[PDB]
């Protein structure tokens, strides 16, 4: 019965491809051809935060657009003040092999994970004054690549063992697990309403999950290599995925196919981080080519470059109010542009 | 500045703490241990004293060796191998008794890697007496079809050493080979002298005189 099942799968894939092709009547570039370009975007370094001594691997913005947490291989996770460049907290990690960090929306907790296969939650607003490890989620057999706080109680984590699992910080048990990826899942992003999320695996595919039901919904495969970053549009109906093929693409949830590709002839390094602007008109992507390029989300052309980093940029993030952008790199320097 | 001066004082204090921690932690000697499965890695990591990554730190002649046994990560190497750069040396362990084509392929993959173009490899060959007994029982031509010569233990060992050492191409790194039977306490001095030589080479390169 294996042959019949294989034939059924092949015909289902053919039907899916035909349906995706049929919905395409005009590309995004064909409709946004009569709008004025945004012009040259000149961004200057306003602040520089020099606290880390190792390669910075992840960073996150605060919900008030003022606080920022940064994690590096030195085994520390510092909390930054963007307006005054002061340091509020310095949390020492148990394992120095850290590859992700998250900041709670309410500002009470900070997550951390890496090669130790355990997600560690820290408590900031403690009555004794110091920061204490509130929980240690240990259920994964592979390195944890991403973790995002859904709320103060439950957190979703993406792991390198081809699995994604929703946790419960109250009791530390896997409430729900998401399976289906063939390779390592190295990216994750939550919806504005925290009702659904997508994962970007190393098998050049992206899947659409929902936290409540716990089943995959749609699969977007257009890339040719490992997907390193992902992020939704502010409206919540589209997302952009950057891969190692030196190109980042725009996918539409409702159209269920591609919209445009953001590639240049003089670009060879793979994408490391992708982020959107507050209005969604500017798509800033980090490159392994030592520079950050600002892409026009509707015109598919370069509006400027963010140069000034001595190494590969590992992470980038736009504030909640859209005021500034922060970029972290492997030379242990974090820069705020405006 | 009314009461933000206390915040500035706190920030300066924790910045000083970070600097002190970095200076204190910069003195550790890092080593990466690789090799095929069931090749005696556990024997050597338990021979010099003391689930994802297993770190075994010990002190020998004022050198704090931080040895990372990362064999527990059954995933794609390319997605996490880049964080192990800046390591002093790579220890490579291979079982001479058995599991040899895989070892050669792994050595070729790890010696020509982009991030490890300057890190020298300290290669170990344990189970010498098991290999000698097997030679006395079976010829060494079974593993290598293209091996021609006398079937002595020394000849076979030298041939395997040459085949392993010929895989490198970068002028800036050298392969250190040693013979062991795992029934010995000499697996710590070899690492020590190789690490000292690598330190001298790195210092000479950094000063620009090399």
């Amino acid at each position: 019965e294996l042959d019949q099942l294989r034939q059924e799968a092949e015909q289902l894939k053919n039907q899916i491809r035909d349906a995706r092709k049929a919905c395409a009547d005009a590309t995004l570039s064909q409709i946004t051809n009569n709008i004025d370009p945004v012009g040259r975007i000149q961004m200057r370094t306003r602040r520089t935060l020099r606290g880390h001594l190792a390669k910075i691997y992840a960073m996150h913005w605060g919900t008030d657009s003022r606080l920022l947490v940064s994690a590096s291989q030195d085994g520390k996770l510092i909390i930054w003040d963007s307006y005054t460049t002061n340091k509020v907290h310095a949390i020492p990690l148990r394992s120095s092999w850290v590859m992700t960090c998250a900041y709670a929306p309410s500002g009470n907790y900070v997550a951390c994970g890496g090669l130790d296969n355990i997600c560690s939650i820290y408590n900031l607003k403690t009555r004794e004054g110091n920061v204490r490890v509130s929980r240690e989620l240990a259920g994964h057999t592979g390195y944890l690549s991403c973790c995002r706080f859904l709320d103060d109680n439950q957190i979703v984590t993406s792991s390198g063992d081809t699995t994604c699992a929703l946790w419960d910080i109250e009791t530390g048990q896997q409430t729900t697990t998401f399976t289906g990826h063939t390779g390592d899942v190295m990216s994750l992003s939550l919806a504005p309403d925290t009702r659904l999320f997508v994962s970007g695996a190393c098998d050049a595919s992206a899947k659409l999950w929902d936290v409540r039901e716990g089943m995959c919904r749609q699969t977007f495969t257009g890339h040719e290599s490992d997907i390193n970053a992902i992020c939704f549009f502010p409206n919540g109906n589209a997302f952009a995925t950057g891969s190692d093929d030196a190109t980042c693409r725009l996918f539409d949830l409702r159209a269920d196919q591609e919209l445009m590709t953001y590639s240049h002839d003089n670009i060879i390094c793979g994408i490391t981080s992708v982020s959107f602007s507050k209005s969604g008109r500017l798509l800033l992507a980090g490159y392994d080519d030592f520079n950050c390029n600002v892409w026009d989300a509707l015109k598919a052309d370069r509006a400027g470059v963010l140069a000034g980093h001595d190494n590969r940029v590992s992470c980038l993030g736009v504030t909640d109010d859209g005021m500034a952008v922060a970029t972290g790199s492997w030379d242990s320097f974090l820069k705020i542009w405006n | 500045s009314a009461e933000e001066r206390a915040a500035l004082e706190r920030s300066k204090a924790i910045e000083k703490n970070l600097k002190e921690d970095g200076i204190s932690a910069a003195k550790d000697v890092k080593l990466l241990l690789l090799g095929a499965d069931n090749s005696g890695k556990s024997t050597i990591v338990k021979q010099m004293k003391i689930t994802g990554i297993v770190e075994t730190h010990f002190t020998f002649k004022n050198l704090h060796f931080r040895l990372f046994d990362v064999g527990g990560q059954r995933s794609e190497r390319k997605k996490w191998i880049h964080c192990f750069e800046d390591v002093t040396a790579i220890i490579f362990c291979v079982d001479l008794s058995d599991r040899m084509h895989e070892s050669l392929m792994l050595f070729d993959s790890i010696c020509n890697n982009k991030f490890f173009i300057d890190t020298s490899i300290i290669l170990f060959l344990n189970k010498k007496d098991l290999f000698g007994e097997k030679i006395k029982k079976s010829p060494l031509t079974i593993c290598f079809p293209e091996y021609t010569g006398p079937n002595t233990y020394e000849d076979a060992a030298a041939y395997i050493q040459a085949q392993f050492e010929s895989k490198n191409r970068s002028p800036n790194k050298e392969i250190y080979c040693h013979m062991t039977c795992a029934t010995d306490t000499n697996n710590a001095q070899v690492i020590f002298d190789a690490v000292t030589d690598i330190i001298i080479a790195n210092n000479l390169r950094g000063c620009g005189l090399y």
Epitope: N86 | A2, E3, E4, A6, A7, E9
Partner: single-chain antibody
């Protein structure tokens, strides 16, 4: 839990000396700045001294500099106040306060118990107009406290503090920075103001809310307390 027990108070002859200890336990004493607050038998509170985290900065009041000195012992988790040349006006019951400072912190959150000590120009003048108000349960009471200077700094934060001292107990922080409610305080307490004139609103006053209410500013040292409006049943 958090405990600040202090002792070393008693009858002292005039012109003598006395050494006071503030034992602390249950919290990280090393990163907390400690104050010293006294209270006259029939008057309000009066700031005395201050030591910072790491023994960086030390300040004294106008009537305190030179005679007194404040020191801490971080490994022993104790705060010390060597006070010398006791005059007749130094009688009070001295408190111990922890005031950790950072962005979003809550200074003056926890107060000590107190030791009785029976002894034989440009500063901000902060005054409360009314010193006594009669209240009844179920009603709303509002207390006002005017400041001589403008307390609103250029960064947008006004430094006004509100405290409540129940009969026979120690003062408890209620409002910090004139708009933020301290942790543990019931939500019925609210505060407001604009630059110079400040007011605090109490809704659905209960029998446990009886006491004397003080207003305090933290703009610059020295710190001046208010006259103290007393609300009685």
């Amino acid at each position: 839990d958090v405990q600040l027990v202090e002792s070393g108070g008693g009858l002292v002859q005039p012109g003598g000396s006395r050494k006071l200890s503030c034992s602390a336990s249950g919290f990280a004493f090393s990163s907390f700045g400690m104050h010293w607050v006294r209270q006259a038998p029939e008057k309000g509170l009066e700031w005395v001294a201050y030591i910072s985290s790491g023994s960086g900065t030390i300040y004294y009041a106008d009537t305190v500099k030179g005679r007194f000195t404040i020191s801490r012992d971080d490994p022993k988790n104790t705060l010390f106040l060597q006070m010398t040349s006791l005059r007749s006006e130094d009688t009070a019951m001295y408190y111990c306060v922890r005031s950790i400072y950072y962005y979003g912190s809550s200074p003056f959150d926890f107060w000590g118990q107190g030791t009785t000590l029976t002894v034989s120009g440009s500063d901000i003048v902060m005054t409360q107009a009314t010193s006594s108000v009669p209240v009844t349960p179920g009603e709303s009471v509002s207390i006002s406290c005017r400041s001589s200077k403008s307390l609103l700094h250029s960064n947008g934060n006004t430094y006004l503090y509100w405290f409540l001292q129940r009969p026979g107990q120690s003062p408890q922080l209620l409002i910090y920075r004139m708009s933020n409610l301290a942790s543990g305080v019931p939500d019925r307490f609210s505060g407001s103001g604009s630059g110079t004139a400040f007011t605090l609103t109490i809704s659905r006053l209960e029998a446990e809310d009886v006491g004397v209410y003080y207003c305090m500013q933290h703009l610059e040292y020295p710190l001046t307390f208010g006259a103290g409006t007393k609300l009685e049943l």
